[PDB]
Amino acid sequence: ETLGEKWKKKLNQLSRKEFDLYKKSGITEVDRTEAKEGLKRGETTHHAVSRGSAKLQWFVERNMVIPEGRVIDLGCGRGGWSYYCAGLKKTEVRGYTKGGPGHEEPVPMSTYGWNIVKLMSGKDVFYLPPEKCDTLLCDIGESSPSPTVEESRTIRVLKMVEPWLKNNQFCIKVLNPYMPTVIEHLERLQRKHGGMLVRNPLSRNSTHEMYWISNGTGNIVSSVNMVSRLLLNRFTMTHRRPTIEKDVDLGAGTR
Ligand SMILES: C[S@@+](CC[C@H](N)C(=O)[O-])C[C@H]1O[C@@H](n2cnc3c(N)ncnc32)[C@H](O)[C@@H]1O
Ligand SMILES: Cc1ccc(C(=O)O)c(NC(=O)Nc2ccc(C(F)(F)F)cc2N)c1
Numbered sequence: 001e002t003l004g005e006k007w008k009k010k011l012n013q014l015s016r017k018e019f020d021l022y023k024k025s026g027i028t029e030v031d032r033t034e035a036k037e038g039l040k041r042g043e044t045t046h047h048a049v050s051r052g053s054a055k056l057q058w059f060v061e062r063n064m065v066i067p068e069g070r071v072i073d074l075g076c077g078r079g080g081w082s083y084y085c086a087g088l089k090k091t092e093v094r095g096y097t098k099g100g101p102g103h104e105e106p107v108p109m110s111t112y113g114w115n116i117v118k119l120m121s122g123k124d125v126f127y128l129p130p131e132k133c134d135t136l137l138c139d140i141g142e143s144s145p146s147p148t149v150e151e152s153r154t155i156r157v158l159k160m161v162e163p164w165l166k167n168n169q170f171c172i173k174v175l176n177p178y179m180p181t182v183i184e185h186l187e188r189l190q191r192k193h194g195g196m197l198v199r200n201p202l203s204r205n206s207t208h209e210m211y212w213i214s215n216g217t218g219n220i221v222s223s224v225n226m227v228s229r230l231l232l233n234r235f236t237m238t239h240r241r242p243t244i245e246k247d248v249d250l251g252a253g254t255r
Pocket of ligand 1: 050051052053074075076077078079080082096097098099102104123124125126139140
């Protein structure tokens with residue numbers, strides 16, 4: 001049994017009180033106060049629509065994925081990854097999201113480069129034919145107390161994304177990366193498309209998610225086990241308040 005399974009088993013034993021203190025212990029987060037306040041007032045400039053803009057910015061600013069040309073954003077939700085890419089110097093952003101009951105709807109914004117963005121709700125990516133693009137982003141993977149449900153969801157995402165991969169820049173969420181069948185798929189995918197699995201410091205401890213990014217190399221099993229050990233160790237000590245960082249200012253204007 002994997003270190004990830006032992007982490008999931010321990011996470012599932014936590015009381016709501018314990019879970020809420022564990023989930024942010026020692027993580028990094030952006031202060032969303034100003035953005036939430038502005039969004040509640042219907043302000044359409046500067047503010048990121050979600051924590052997602054800062055989450056993707058973390059990989060981009062480290063050259064792990066370098067968005068360029070036509071960007072496809074799978075599971076765009078409110079549009080945080082889309083509006084962030086829209087301001088990047090290297091042309092078009094197309095976001096798809098399911099929407100409807102229990103899902104986020106795209107939020108219309110006037111942040112920098114809004115005019116090159118089209119977000120489409122009512123779209124289940126599991127029924128979409130692949131489109132030509134220069135950057136493929138995917139942030140899909142719903143957490144579940146069941147690791148076997150999470151394993152099925154992760155494989156489904158990895159099988160779905162592959163036909164969109166054609167020597168392009170990519171950043172794909174891998175919800176549950178520790179299950180041996182997931183590792184098998186990731187290893188096969190890394191041999192063909194390259195890239196590496198990376199843990200984002202903005203991820204909560206309540207998810208084992210890692211992202212498969214195009215610009216990197218490394219041992220997937222080693223990176224996964226290092227994350228399992230990190231998350232397991234964070235159950236040991238009293239809550240460490242999260243490291244607080246500034247949220248992104250996405251500005252205003254057309255491109
Ligand atoms: C983690 S959120 C994305 C956050 C986004 N990256 C941002 O920056 O705001 C994942 C989104 O995927 C959507 N989603 C889940 N399953 C989907 C599917 N089958 N097709 C399309 N969208 C889906 C969810 O509704 C949710 O809004
Ligand atoms: C559990 C949860 C948490 C956050 C959200 C969100 O969007 O931050 C969410 N969202 C929703 O439920 N969305 C939703 C609810 C109802 C309808 C409908 F049917 F048309 F009336 C449409 C949508 N898109 C659910």
